[PDB]
């Protein structure tokens, strides 16, 4: 969570970890046939009715917000309206991320094109070289 504002932020060059060594262990055929399709399968199965994921995430997000406010030592009001607003916003952000992966294109493009774009971004050496040394972008 962002130390300044109550939001879910990563702020890293890549969306997730997929380095050359894991890619080589999987292999191109498997990377195309299993990895790419499974992510979209999970997203589709979880976001079938869009009101289920938010209901599942409500309590988790509420607990995260309570921890953040307590650690910042700046509640000073225990305002229920603020809690409700922040919880709704964070749940909406997470559900937006989940719904992006489960959406099919409009033209004659393959079903999982967003996942392919994300994999290209995560394997691009240009942004794979801006990571920290402890992250070991190589391997």
């Amino acid at each position: 969570m962002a130390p300044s504002r109550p939001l879910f932020q990563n702020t890293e060059p890549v969306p997730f970890r997929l380095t050359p060594n894991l890619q080589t262990l999987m292999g191109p055929l498997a990377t195309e046939g299993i990895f790419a399709a499974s992510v979209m399968a999970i997203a589709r199965c979880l976001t079938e009715p869009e009101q289920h994921l938010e209901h599942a995430l409500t309590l988790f997000v509420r607990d995260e917000m309570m921890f953040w406010f307590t650690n910042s030592h700046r509640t000073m009001s225990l305002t229920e309206n603020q809690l409700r607003e922040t919880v709704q916003a964070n749940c909406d952000m997470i559900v937006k991320k989940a719904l992006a992966l489960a959406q099919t294109p409009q033209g004659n493009l393959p079903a999982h094109q967003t996942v392919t774009d994300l994999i290209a971004k995560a394997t691009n050496p240009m942004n794979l070289a801006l990571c920290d040394a402890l992250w070991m972008p190589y391997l």
Partner: peptide, 22 residues
């Protein structure tokens, strides 16, 4: 390029690790 090679790139396909990069 290189017909019937699985290392070719295509905007609709993953890059592949055995070639330098797209």
């Amino acid at each position: 390029t290189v017909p019937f090679s699985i290392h070719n790139h295509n905007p609709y396909i993953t890059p592949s690790p055995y070639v330098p990069y797209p």
